[PDB]
Amino acid sequence: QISACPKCGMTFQQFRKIGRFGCSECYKTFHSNITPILRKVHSGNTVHAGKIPKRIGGNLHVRRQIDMLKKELESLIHQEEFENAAHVRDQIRLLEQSLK
Template identity: 30%
Template structure:
């Protein structure tokens, strides 16, 4: 949900660094356009009079636009934290991150990540589930378990 209007779904996710503290702001298309924000090639917002300044009442030192999946809403930050994607479209959205985290065999074809088969995905989820349980992150483990269960049920 958009931080500015609290009505529409956020499509821009901005992470701000202010006094060594990360601040997340989520904006819908309209609020993003009306804010006057523009992204420089470096990925930082180059307008100091941004809507974020008004919303937070602070000077924003650094902002980056966050990548996310349009289909399920999983963000790059969420993927980096959990290592688990939300849907099949996430494989295309986060393919560079996935390649870094899970190196593929030589027979991988560079036509998107559709070559990840069911067994590899299930193994990845199981590995994440074991890690979450080992780290005593039971809520995260339950979410992964549910994703695993839903995925296997869809394949039967």
């Protein structure tokens, strides 16, 4: 739908007028709407084929593991290998405690 940024405050129609983003989270809030914009500015391209920063790059790989693991848990729950869902529950706790 049509929301505003919880941090910038900026709403999409503001973004249309101003043409400049409010904060990190405006990309989050306008994700759907931005993609036609990027396609147009960068010759159809829309995904970063570039550089991962050093420090936070590894913490972003951990959140990828977490979320893959969150999905293995879900199948295992729709399946009924619950001894193994116990394993994933604790594997996920592991990866979040490493962030802390």
